[PDB]
Amino acid sequence: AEIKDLSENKLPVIYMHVPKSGALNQKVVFYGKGTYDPDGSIAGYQWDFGDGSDFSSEQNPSHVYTKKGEYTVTLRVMDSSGQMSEKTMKIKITD
Ligand SMILES: [Ca+2]
């Protein structure tokens, strides 16, 4: 069998569940569950909560937003070949 080039790698497919709404000062949970690599495995997650907080490396992070507003959440995922996909969602924080 010939060695297959890295350019043939299939990228990770992101499943990202961010609720449309959350409440000020209350824990919300986001889910990356189901994210998969069609020809390998998932090697890492990176969530940006959109509020200046440290990013999370968790699959399914909890977070508290401490001001009302709309936040863009970005999830980047790396597969077992070191290659990446990204998705975004918006959450609106109200009282
Ligand atoms: Ca792959």
Numbering used by the authors: 766 to 860
Question: What do the study's own words say?
Answer:
The X-ray crystal structures of Ca2+-bound holo s2a (space group C2), Ca2+-free apo s2a (space group P61), Ca2+-bound holo s2b (space group P21) and two new forms of N-terminally truncated wild-type apo s2 (space groups P21 and P212121) are reported for the first time. Comparison of crystal structures of ColG s2 with crystal structures of ColH s2a and s2b suggests that despite common tertiary folds, PKD-like domains can be grouped into two subsets.
Each holo s2b structure begins at residue 766 and the last residue is 860. The first bulge occurs when Pro784 breaks β-strand A and pushes the subsequent Lys785 outwards, which in turn leads to an approximately 127° angle between β-strands A and A′ that also changes the allegiance of β-strand A′ to β-strand G. The second conserved bulge is introduced by Lys798 and Gly799. Temperature factors for both NCS-related structures are low (the average B factor for molecule A is 11.7 Å2 and that for molecule B is 9.9 Å2). In s2b, the insertion of Asp819 results in the region adopting an ω-loop (i→i + 10). In s2b, Ca2+ chelation by Asn774 and Lys775 could stabilize a 310-helix (residues 770–774) that aligns with the cylinder axis. Meanwhile, the N-terminal linker structure of a PKD-like domain is described for the first time in the holo s2b structure and suggests that Ca2+ repositions the linker along the barrel axis. Of the three domains, s2b is the most stable.
